Design a protein around this nucleic acid. Structure first.
Ligand SMILES: [Mg+2]
Lengths: 121, 65, 181, 54, 458
RNA sequence: UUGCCGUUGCUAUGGC
């Protein structure tokens, strides 16, 4: 019913943000709504993360429209300041994207989180 | 650096001594000869070197302790 | 004289080694898991057969039998600990549903491959046998080493390994010395 | 809108900046059952502060 | 015979106690209690938070990032003060850093009076290294954000580092740079500094996932410590070499035995599902953001879920936890959550209380070997807590609402006789968090040093 | 007591 949906819980958000920090270290993270849009256009995004406290929320609702069209999992986190923190950027992030790479060193947990996100959807 | 940890310490006044198992962490080193172990234990327990005996030392597979 | 030290055979020859379907099966198992020979497959099969025969015998016993409860619970705990049996499947019936592949994946070789430390199962084998892999703080050189759930997260390059932060191996420093000279 | 100069060196920076603001403005309108002009006003005001800066 | 010498020193020391007055016997245990790594300053109950004289002093420089305070101390072993010189007898100094690349020192001797500026030094683009090589990053001044400051216990040097991957040590009297020690790492940005109490040893936490140990008197590097899987954000030290650190998102607090070259692991591992079941809002910890050692055998940490955790060396898990210590953030405004004209539609987007999140513990400082410690946030008040006698739990002693903004670093200074001691709390206040500017601008936040003098009566 | 701009006393705090 709410526009931000599904919204990850306190437990689930941690593992998602865990993958986010690991991805940032390995240059496998795309930060910001504009970048996430580009990845969805290219079909190189494993899944998309959004912040449910975006002010206003609407300016990132185009990712959900893109996502299930391309059959890409997505999920919302309560906080953007927290999301920006894990991203490694000194500013809040309302949306980010995990780039697809089957040769990545952190593949396994990416699929683990992705499986849960699919279940939540 | 090398560290010596004493475990399972028992006080045997029957034989007038203290027994224990010595674990020696020696990163980046082949092993510690009984002489250095004796002088370090003597310093730690504040006794004469001749009063310290050490034996039965085995380095685990892979080295380091 | 001194008392005997017991010994046992860890593998048994099959009832019919010459089945073509079987031969293809060991071809699969060796190829995918990079096993040196058939004896490894036979060993794993023998262990699995012992386990499942014990499970069957336990099942034959009536429910609530103290022997059944105790021994079945012990077997399930061990199988969960080694990781073949998943947490949500703690019943003796699913033990009978185990397969050789489950044990094979838990081998340190396969785990090293999956974790990304090696680019091939054979690369994993050569890395292990060359003393580059350490579980926790200890170095393991045995591809048949079985990894536990807790041990799985601690697999890493050994401190003494050149890949693990030690000095370069003999070839590297030899090449550097000749280049400097 | 770069063929009809809808958004139009320092001038070019404004155009790219304005284009971004127009993009999110479209997002608010499209995914809103009853869009309001409250955000567009401040968003345009944000452009104005960016305009005077250059 | 040196024992006679100890007897003379003990005899003179005994005469002092008689002037200070059972009472003599207790005070004898207290003075040596620093040797025994246990809490021995039980003054929380007698403390008077409500009557604290709070003051906020504005400062020009932006985003005051850290503060280091120097206190001369009488040494029982030699019965001499720690002052560097006879002029500095009983003179209290505070050093501050900011994101403006400026060092400033203040005189804090007079508790009743606000901090008084003495000297400053400023960095800028002039000090950028031309070489572009790590080992030649040896310019006299800073060029990037200065994050930390620490004062030597001897009162002879003050040392600062930041994102320039440099650690500059300056003379306390003139703030003259005497040595530059590059970290010699591409990502080795200094995040925290801690001086070993009553020693010249300095422990530096760097962003390259390592801890570096230096000797200031020799102006040389000693060792590097490894084991953290993420940035080492904070470090605390006591008289003993068991310095503690927290690795941020690795969610693991680490105690380093330097001479033993070993390291003890500490992890929270709390989960809301069990907490709710045992109850039958709780926010799961993401990262540990501050650490300070109450004791040689105990320490405390703050998280980014607002959880203050008490620890003991014996046990790996936390011994006591205080969830959402500083409260929950204000709810996002409905007028700004969505662009819908209808207000009820906007309220639905708030999604009840699910979007609510807790404050972060930006600062957490404990007076050494005491039963009281201070925590800070941008909630707008400093909270003072008291640990139980058994060291198994702690309670909120009180609050000080004077501070308004992010509390980058909290310091405490004491003066007066042993029986009658006045405690003055100095906390650097900024408009943005030290490590970066994630935080939304807090209404009213100002750049300044917050001061609160607390009197001790019972 | 502040880099700048105000208010408030003869000192204290509002904004960037
Ligand atoms: Mg070797």
């Amino acid at each position: 019913n709410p526009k931000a949906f599904p919204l990850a819980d306190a437990a689930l958000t941690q593992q998602i943000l865990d993958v986010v920090q690991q991805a940032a270290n390995l240059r496998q993270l795309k930060k910001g709504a504009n970048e996430a849009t580009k990845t969805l256009n290219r079909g190189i995004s494993e899944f998309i993360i959004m912040a449910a406290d975006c002010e206003p929320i609407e300016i990132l609702l185009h990712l959900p429209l893109l996502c299930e069209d391309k059959n890409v999992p997505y999920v919302f986190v309560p906080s953007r300041v927290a999301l920006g923190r894990a991203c490694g950027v000194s500013r809040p992030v309302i949306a980010a994207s995990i780039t697809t790479n089957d040769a990545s060193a952190i593949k396994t947990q990416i699929y683990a989180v992705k499986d849960k996100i699919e279940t939540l959807l | 650096a090398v560290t010596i940890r004493t475990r399972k310490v028992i006080s045997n006044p029957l034989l007038a001594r203290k027994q224990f198992v010595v674990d020696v962490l020696h990163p980046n080193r082949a092993n510690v000869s009984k002489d250095e172990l004796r002088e370090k234990l003597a310093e730690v327990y504040k006794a004469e070197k001749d009063a310290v005996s050490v034996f039965g030392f085995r380095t685990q597979f892979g080295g380091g302790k | 004289p001194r008392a005997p030290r017991t010994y046992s055979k860890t593998y048994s020859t099959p009832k019919r080694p010459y089945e073509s379907s079987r031969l293809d099966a060991e071809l699969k198992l060796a190829g995918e898991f990079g096993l040196k020979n058939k004896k490894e497959i036979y060993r794993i099969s023998f262990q699995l057969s012992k386990i499942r025969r014990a499970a069957r015998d336990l099942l034959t016993r009536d429910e609530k039998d103290p022997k059944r409860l105790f021994e079945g619970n012990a077997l399930i705990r061990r199988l969960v600990r080694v990781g073949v049996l998943s947490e949500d499947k703690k019943k003796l019936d699913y033990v009978l549903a185990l397969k050789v592949e489950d044990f094979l994946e838990r081998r340190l070789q396969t785990q090293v491959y999956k974790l990304g430390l090696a680019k091939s199962v054979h690369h994993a084998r050569v890395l292990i046998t060359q003393r580059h892999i350490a579980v926790g703080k200890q170095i393991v050189n045995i591809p048949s080493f079985m990894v536990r759930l807790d041990s799985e997260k601690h697999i890493d390059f050994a401190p003494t390994s050149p890949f693990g932060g030690a000095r370069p191996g003999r070839v590297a420093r030899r090449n550097a010395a000749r280049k400097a000279e | 809108g770069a063929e009809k100069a809808l958004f139009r060196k320092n001038k070019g920076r404004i155009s790219r900046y304005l284009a971004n603001k127009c993009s999110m403005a479209s997002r608010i309108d499209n995914y809103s059952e009853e869009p309001s002009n409250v955000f567009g006003s401040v968003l345009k005001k944000q452009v104005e502060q960016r305009l005077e800066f250059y | 015979n040196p024992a006679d010498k100890r007897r003379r020193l003990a005899k003179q020391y005994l005469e002092n106690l008689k002037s200070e007055a059972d009472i003599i016997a207790s005070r004898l245990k207290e003075d040596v209690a620093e040797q025994q790594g246990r809490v021995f300053r039980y003054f929380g109950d007698k403390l008077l938070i409500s009557e604290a004289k709070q003051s906020f002093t504005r400062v020009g420089e932006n985003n005051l990032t850290c503060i280091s305070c120097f206190q001369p101390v009488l040494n029982k072993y030699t019965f001499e003060e720690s002052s560097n010189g006879d002029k500095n007898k009983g003179r209290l100094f505070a050093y501050t850093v900011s994101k403006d690349l400026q060092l400033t020192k203040y005189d804090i001797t007079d508790f009743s009076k606000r901090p008084k500026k003495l000297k400053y030094a400023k960095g800028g683009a002039k000090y950028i290294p031309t070489s572009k090589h790590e080992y030649e990053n040896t310019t006299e001044g800073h060029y990037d954000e200065i994050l930390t400051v620490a004062a030597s216990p001897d009162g002879k040097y003050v040392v600062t580092g930041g994102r320039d991957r440099k650690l500059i040590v300056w003379s306390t009297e003139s703030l003259s740079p005497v040595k530059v020690i590059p970290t010699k790492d591409r990502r080795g940005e200094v995040l925290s500094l801690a001086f070993r109490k009553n020693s010249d040893q300095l422990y530096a936490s760097c962003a390259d996932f390592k801890i570096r140990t230096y000797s200031i008197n020799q102006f040389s590097q000693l060792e590097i410590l490894y084991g953290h899987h993420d940035i080492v954000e904070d470090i605390s030290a006591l008289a003993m070499e068991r310095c503690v650190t927290v690795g941020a998102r690795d969610r693991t607090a680490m105690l380093w035995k330097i001479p033993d070259e070993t390291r003890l692991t500490f992890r929270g591992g709390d989960e809301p599902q069990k907490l709710l079941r045992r109850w039958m809002l709780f926010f799961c910890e993401g990262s540990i953001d501050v650490v300070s050692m109450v004791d040689d055998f105990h320490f405390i940490t703050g998280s980014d879920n607002g959880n203050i955790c008490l620890w003991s060396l014996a046990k790996k898990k936390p011994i006591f936890t205080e969830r959402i210590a500083h409260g929950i953030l204000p709810e996002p405004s409905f007028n700004d959550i969505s662009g819908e004209t209808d207000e009820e539609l906007r309220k639905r987007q708030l999604q009840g209380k699910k979007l609510l999140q807790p404050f972060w513990i930006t600062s957490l400082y404990a007076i050494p070997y005491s039963n009281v410690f201070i925590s800070g946030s941008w909630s707008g008040s400093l909270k003072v807590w008291k640990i139980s006698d058994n060291l198994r739990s702690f309670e909120l002693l009180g609050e000080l609402s004077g501070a308004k903004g992010v509390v980058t670093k909290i310091q405490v200074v004491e003066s007066g006789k042993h029986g009658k001691e006045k405690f003055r709390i100095l906390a650097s206040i900024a408009k943005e968090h030290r490590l970066g500017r994630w935080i939304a601008n807090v209404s009213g936040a100002r750049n300044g040093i917050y001061s609160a003098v607390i009197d001790q009566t019972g």
